[PDB]
Amino acid sequence: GKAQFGGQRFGEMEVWALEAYGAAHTLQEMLTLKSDDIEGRNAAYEAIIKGEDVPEPSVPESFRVLVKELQALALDVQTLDEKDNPVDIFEGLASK
């Protein structure tokens, strides 16, 4: 919303347009760097004002919310690697 100084909604159909174009990196930025990659969006702004290229993005926070909401439903959602070993996307902040 303009009143809230808000961004433009990049809905599903707009995402499909980037997928059809093949703009994998343009789509990835709008999903992570410009929306909810908290570490990515802070680094992207800092890199630009220093004259550098924006860094490689990271996992979005919305997916982190999805994992936690799925766990609250007693569903064990685990992100694995090539060798099926679990990968911690919370950076050790949720592991006891």
Binding site: N42, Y45, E46
Partner: protein, 336 residues
């Protein structure tokens, strides 16, 4: 499919107690309670422990202290002579009567609970809270006074229902004493509202409350009594907008705020570079740029092996050259 209808049907399968039946059950509970005390005094066991064992046996094996210690205590009671075993029988009959007395009065709580609906707790929640008061009524009820059970149980059922509303009807819990104040304030405002033919101001409400009340306290009480608003309340006829969509997150630093903090550190590091190899470490320790916490002059001294006056001289010297370097360059005033 209706939980309320299902409960009402279940309580309807227990016939209501006549006066003769009610007195017999009340007498048995009173006799059973006394026998438990006699058993505990003779055997030396905890009166609560014997009551649970007697309660556990009466309730049967359909209820999950481990069962082995129940059996050992039960066998110990059964080993007593006939005179002492007679109190075990009275305890068993008393506990069975207590269960029957509670079940046969489940209609009384429903009649009371139906008058508390709409105050923050659902109808079934009101009933179960009232049941807890009904159980306490059975323990405290005395048939010697010849008062009917409905006379005494009503006080305990209403108490449990009213207390539960004060403790569970608000997302942000408010103590009973403050909840009572809010109800009294609402009654006073309502009574004044009809008398004045308009909404009373905080001055009229405060005067009617009595001594110790002013407009400030009435205003604060109303502010406390504000329930939190749901983040999922829709706005507009279209069901696509909610409260949470308009509340910014002011906890996490913004990208601008995070960037200027890193810019400040880089500029501060360059300023500390001009300082001596010894002064910079002292200043960063005193300002907590290394450990994250400030260090007192003695601790900084204990770190380097000098008295407190040395650090206070180094810090005042390191902090003064930075003023000179900053003034002669003006590369650090913007961050302030």
């Amino acid at each position: 499919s209706d939980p309320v209808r299902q409960y009402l049907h279940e309580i309807g399968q227990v016939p209501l107690l006549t006066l003769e039946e009610e007195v017999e059950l009340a007498r048995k509970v009173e006799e059973g309670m006394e026998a438990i005390k006699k058993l505990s005094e003779i055997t030396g066991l905890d009166p609560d422990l014997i009551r649970e064992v007697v309660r556990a046996k009466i309730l049967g094996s359909a209820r999950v202290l481990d069962p082995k210690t129940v059996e050992e205590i039960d066998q110990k009671l059964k080993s007593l002579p006939k005179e002492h075993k007679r109190y075990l029988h009275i305890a068993r009959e008393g506990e069975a009567a207590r269960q029957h007395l509670i079940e046969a009065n489940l209609r009384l709580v429903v009649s009371i609970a139906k008058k508390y609906t709409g105050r923050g707790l659902s109808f079934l929640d009101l009933i179960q809270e009232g049941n807890q008061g009904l159980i306490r009524a059975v323990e405290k009820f005395e048939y010697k006074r010849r008062f009917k059970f409905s006379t005494y149980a009503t006080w305990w059922i209403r108490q449990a229902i009213n207390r539960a509303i004060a403790d569970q009807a608000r997302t942000i819990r408010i103590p009973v004493h403050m909840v009572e104040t809010i109800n009294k304030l609402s009654r006073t405002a309502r009574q004044l509202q009809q008398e004045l033919g308009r909404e009373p101001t905080y001055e009229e409400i405060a005067e009617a409350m009595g001594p110790g009340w002013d407009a400030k306290r009435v205003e604060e009480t109303l502010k406390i009594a504000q329930e939190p608003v749901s983040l999922e309340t829709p706005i507009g006829d279209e069901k696509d907008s909610f409260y949470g969509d308009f509340i910014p997150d002011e906890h996490l630093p913004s990208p601008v705020d995070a960037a200027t903090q890193s810019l400040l550190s880089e500029e501060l590091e360059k300023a500390l570079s001009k300082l001596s190899e010894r002064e910079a470490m002292v200043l960063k320790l005193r300002k907590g740029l290394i450990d994250g916490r400030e260090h007192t002059l003695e601790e900084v001294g204990a770190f380097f092996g000098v008295t407190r006056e040395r650090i206070r001289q180094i810090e005042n010297k390191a902090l003064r050259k930075l003023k000179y370097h900053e003034s002669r360059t003006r590369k650090l005033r913007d961050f302030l």
